Design an enzyme around this catalytic site. Sequence first.
Site, mmCIF file in Angstrom:
data_model
loop_
_atom_site.group_PDB
_atom_site.id
_atom_site.type_symbol
_atom_site.label_atom_id
_atom_site.label_comp_id
_atom_site.label_asym_id
_atom_site.label_seq_id
_atom_site.Cartn_x
_atom_site.Cartn_y
_atom_site.Cartn_z
ATOM 1 C CG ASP B 25 -1.484 2.268 7.786
ATOM 2 O OD1 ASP B 25 -1.383 3.318 7.340
ATOM 3 O OD2 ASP B 25 -1.206 1.080 7.504
ATOM 4 C CB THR B 26 -1.520 8.196 10.021
ATOM 5 O OG1 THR B 26 -0.589 8.493 9.027
ATOM 6 C CG2 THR B 26 -0.763 8.352 11.399
ATOM 7 N N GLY B 27 -2.712 6.207 7.537
ATOM 8 C CA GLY B 27 -3.514 6.393 6.306
ATOM 9 C C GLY B 27 -4.668 5.348 6.347
HETATM 10 O O1 LIG Z 1 -3.328 -0.817 0.965
HETATM 11 C C1 LIG Z 1 -2.991 -0.084 1.713
HETATM 12 N N1 LIG Z 1 -1.725 0.223 2.189
HETATM 13 C C2 LIG Z 1 -0.780 -0.287 0.803
HETATM 14 C C3 LIG Z 1 0.507 0.716 0.314
HETATM 15 C C4 LIG Z 1 0.318 1.961 0.042
HETATM 16 C C5 LIG Z 1 1.272 2.911 -0.680
HETATM 17 C C6 LIG Z 1 2.607 1.919 -0.682
HETATM 18 C C7 LIG Z 1 3.712 2.790 -1.035
HETATM 19 C C8 LIG Z 1 4.926 1.960 -1.269
HETATM 20 C C9 LIG Z 1 5.329 0.650 -0.553
HETATM 21 C C10 LIG Z 1 4.093 0.140 -0.580
HETATM 22 C C11 LIG Z 1 2.908 0.669 -0.050
HETATM 23 C C12 LIG Z 1 1.801 -0.045 0.473
HETATM 24 C C13 LIG Z 1 -0.866 0.526 3.146
HETATM 25 C C14 LIG Z 1 -0.845 -0.623 4.332
HETATM 26 C C15 LIG Z 1 0.013 -1.752 3.854
HETATM 27 C C16 LIG Z 1 1.385 -1.448 3.740
HETATM 28 C C17 LIG Z 1 2.048 -2.556 3.393
HETATM 29 C C18 LIG Z 1 1.584 -3.885 2.975
HETATM 30 C C19 LIG Z 1 0.161 -3.947 2.971
HETATM 31 C C20 LIG Z 1 -0.535 -2.947 3.336
HETATM 32 C C21 LIG Z 1 -1.161 2.032 3.705
HETATM 33 O O2 LIG Z 1 -0.352 2.412 4.701
HETATM 34 C C22 LIG Z 1 -2.540 2.221 4.401
HETATM 35 O O3 LIG Z 1 -2.753 3.490 4.930
HETATM 36 C C23 LIG Z 1 -3.641 2.043 3.210
HETATM 37 C C24 LIG Z 1 -3.757 3.167 2.223
HETATM 38 C C25 LIG Z 1 -5.090 3.474 1.424
HETATM 39 C C26 LIG Z 1 -5.793 4.202 2.121
HETATM 40 C C27 LIG Z 1 -7.207 4.358 1.570
HETATM 41 C C28 LIG Z 1 -7.557 3.447 0.322
HETATM 42 C C29 LIG Z 1 -6.368 2.737 -0.345
HETATM 43 C C30 LIG Z 1 -5.127 2.527 0.246
HETATM 44 N N2 LIG Z 1 -3.818 0.670 2.477
HETATM 45 C C31 LIG Z 1 -4.917 0.194 2.505
HETATM 46 C C32 LIG Z 1 -6.032 0.141 4.029
HETATM 47 C C33 LIG Z 1 -5.439 -0.415 5.126
HETATM 48 C C34 LIG Z 1 -6.265 -0.645 6.356
HETATM 49 C C35 LIG Z 1 -7.624 -0.391 6.068
HETATM 50 C C36 LIG Z 1 -8.499 -0.732 7.432
HETATM 51 C C37 LIG Z 1 -9.757 -0.386 7.308
HETATM 52 C C38 LIG Z 1 -10.438 0.184 5.968
HETATM 53 C C39 LIG Z 1 -9.495 0.349 4.977
HETATM 54 C C40 LIG Z 1 -8.132 0.175 4.924
HETATM 55 C C41 LIG Z 1 -7.339 0.253 3.765
#
Ligand SMILES: O=C1N(Cc2ccc3ccccc3c2)[C@H](Cc2ccccc2)[C@H](O)[C@@H](O)[C@@H](Cc2ccccc2)N1Cc1ccc2ccccc2c1
Lengths: 99, 99
Positions: B25-27
């Site tokens: 996960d690059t996000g």
């Molecule tokens: O909540 C997140 N999502 C949900 C997500 C986002 C868009 C979607 C679009 C379509 C369908 C589903 C979607 C889900 C993903 C991870 C994920 C994937 C699937 C199920 C559960 C989680 C994403 O890949 C990840 O980078 C971040 C995106 C994000 C970044 C910053 C702020 C808010 C959201 N996090 C939080 C995330 C994940 C891990 C983290 C680790 C440390 C600190 C913060 C973190 C945040």
Amino acid sequence: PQVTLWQRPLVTIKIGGQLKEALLDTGADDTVLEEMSLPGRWKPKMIGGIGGFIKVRQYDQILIEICGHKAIGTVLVGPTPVNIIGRNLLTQIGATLNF
Amino acid sequence: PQVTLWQRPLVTIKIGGQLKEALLDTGADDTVLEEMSLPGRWKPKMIGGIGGFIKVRQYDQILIEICGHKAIGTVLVGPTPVNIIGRNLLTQIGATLNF
Ligand SMILES: O=C1N(Cc2ccc3ccccc3c2)[C@H](Cc2ccccc2)[C@H](O)[C@@H](O)[C@@H](Cc2ccccc2)N1Cc1ccc2ccccc2c1
């Protein structure tokens, strides 16, 4: 380009005539944008993330330009804390992950 | 390997003697594993996603083998629905994004 991941991989997009930046996100299946004016109709959808579910509007066939690359596809708009480009659009601009 | 993104970029990891698959996960700035029992001492931390926030416990200096490449770093553990490898480790295994 190649993006190393010491920084958030953020990029500039244009969508709807507006300029935004968004995170390149391999874990996200779809693209989710903060609250915006988009020309069209939409369907309600909910998506789930780390902390729970949000309700978004799905719009289809939306044009985006992510760097100098156009893609057309589904964009969900909603109360995300960050604009996220997910795998639906990443495949279209030909992005890959390499290690 | 070069991973195209037509499917979720999932890999096999070994951590704490157990085998798990996790999303690359690059996000995500950090790595969050589902509840798993992992030896040592830890602090609580709160992380926010889409949807909001979860309390995680964090362990530093954990060994992970991610597709048979080693790394050591912070792992958060807590109620995530998917095991996520985020940038903190993606950087050690040398991953890049390319388009
Ligand atoms: O909540 C997140 N999502 C949900 C997500 C986002 C868009 C979607 C679009 C379509 C369908 C589903 C979607 C889900 C993903 C991870 C994920 C994937 C699937 C199920 C559960 C989680 C994403 O890949 C990840 O980078 C971040 C995106 C994000 C970044 C910053 C702020 C808010 C959201 N996090 C939080 C995330 C994940 C891990 C983290 C680790 C440390 C600190 C913060 C973190 C945040």
